Amino acid sequence: GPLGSTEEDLEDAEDTVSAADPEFCHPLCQCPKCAPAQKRLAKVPASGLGVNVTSQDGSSW
C-alpha cells in the first residue's frame, strides 16, 4: 500500500499555527518581507476553480 513499508514515518505529530510572521531588514522597516517577488516574477499556479472556469445559466439557455 504505502511506499514505505515502515508503519511510522511522520516528522512532526502536530503542526503549529501563527497570525503573521513579518521580517525586519533594518530599523524602521515593518515591511512584509521586502522580497523580490513582484509582477515581473511569476508564481506557480495552484488553484482548482478560478477565472479560467466560467458558469452559465441553464434556464437562460
Partner: protein, 192 residues
Amino acid sequence: GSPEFGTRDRMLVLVLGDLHIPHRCNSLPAKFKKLLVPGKIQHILCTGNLCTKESYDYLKTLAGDVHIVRGDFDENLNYPEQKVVTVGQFKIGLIHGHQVIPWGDMASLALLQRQFDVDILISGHTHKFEAFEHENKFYINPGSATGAYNALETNIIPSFVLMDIQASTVVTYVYQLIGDDVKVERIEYKKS
C-alpha cells in the same frame, strides 16, 4: 541552552537633519515617511537646521526624546550651538558643521573631537552622507533627509541614518534614495 546575557539595554537612535523646510523643501521624500514610524525609535539626534518648528513637531512624533543643535538657518535661536549626549556606553557630540572651517574638512572635525572628548561626532551642513573612522574615533554625517539643495554640490541624495547600539558596539544603517527604490548599507563600529 542558557541566555548569553541577563538583560538587554540595546537602543536604536535616528540621525538626520538639513531638511531646510520650507526654505528649499516642503517635506521628506515619500518612501522615507513610510520608513519612519513612532514606537520604533527611542532616541533622535538632529544636526542640520529644521528650520521651521513645524518639522520639530514631526520629529517629536517619531520619538519623545529628541536632541537638536542650532543650524545656520534655524528660526529658533534657543537651540544649542553644540551638545554632548551620552547614549549607553557611547559619548556622542552634536554640531551643525557651518562652525567647522573648512566646512567639510576631516582634520577640522577631528580637532573638534578632541575638545568635545566624544567617541562619536555627528555633523552635517555638507548634505553629503559620510561614515568613517579616524584615530579610534567615529564620525557620522546623515546628510539631508530631504536632499535639500546645496550650492557646493549639484547632485544631492536625500538620506537618513539609524544607529543600533547593543552595548559597546554600534551598527549604523544609512538609507539613500537612489532611483525609485531605496538602497541601504550596513556599517558596524565598536569601542574595541
